[PDB]
């Protein structure tokens, strides 16, 4: 079923890639899909490099139902893996 | 220089302004956010807001003098690099409190903590191109 309200809840994205290329645009991409759903965005910030991986973390605040669809909707690049979670 | 909650503050300033440059949220609410969620124990955070700040509105001035050294370049300059690279200008050309050496020594460390693979070399190459012109005494 539906995931209802989501009050207080934040879906956390962590984001890793070889390629800054890659990482920077899917991260880029999550940010303008979040802030068009009517989400507010944390971060994105970058970590340091940690053995030729780029990392990055992104946080959505204010999730709404039109947030998580636009989320699954959205194709991300081959070559970068999304951990996510909603919580 | 310098002391180590400076250059943390430095180290966070990256971080923060990559934010900006992301999210195009407002600065205030990006240096608001920034400090109230991330680990700030050991920056001296008066740099750190001074850095966002100034970063952000002067903006095109850094990018204006950057943008003849990115001429050569196929691809977009990084997000990482172009944070640095604005940090590093602003530095030099507007925050003469900070030494000259240590400027240009902690944008390549930061470039080589954070950036593309010879991410501290391209931005080596830059500052030794830019930095002279902006601080002509070299200090």
Known sequence: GPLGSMQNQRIRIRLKA???????????????????????????????????????????????????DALMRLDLAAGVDVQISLG | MEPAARRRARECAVQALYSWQLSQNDIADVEYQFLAEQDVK???????????????????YLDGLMKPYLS????????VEKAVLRIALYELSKRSDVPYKVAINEAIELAKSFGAEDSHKFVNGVLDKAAPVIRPNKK
């Open chain 1, 18 to 68: 070889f390629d800054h290329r890659l990482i920077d645009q899917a991260t880029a991409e999550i940010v303008e899909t979040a802030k068009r759903t009517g989400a507010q965005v944390r971060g994105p910030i970058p970590l340091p490099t940690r053995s030729r991986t780029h990392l990055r973390l992104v946080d959505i605040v204010e999730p709404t139902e039109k947030t998580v």
């Open chain 2, 72 to 79: 050569r370049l196929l691809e977009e300059l990084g997000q």
């Open chain 2, 42 to 60: 050991d920056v001296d955070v008066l740099y750190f807001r001074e850095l966002l700040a100034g970063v952000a509105t002067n903006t095109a």
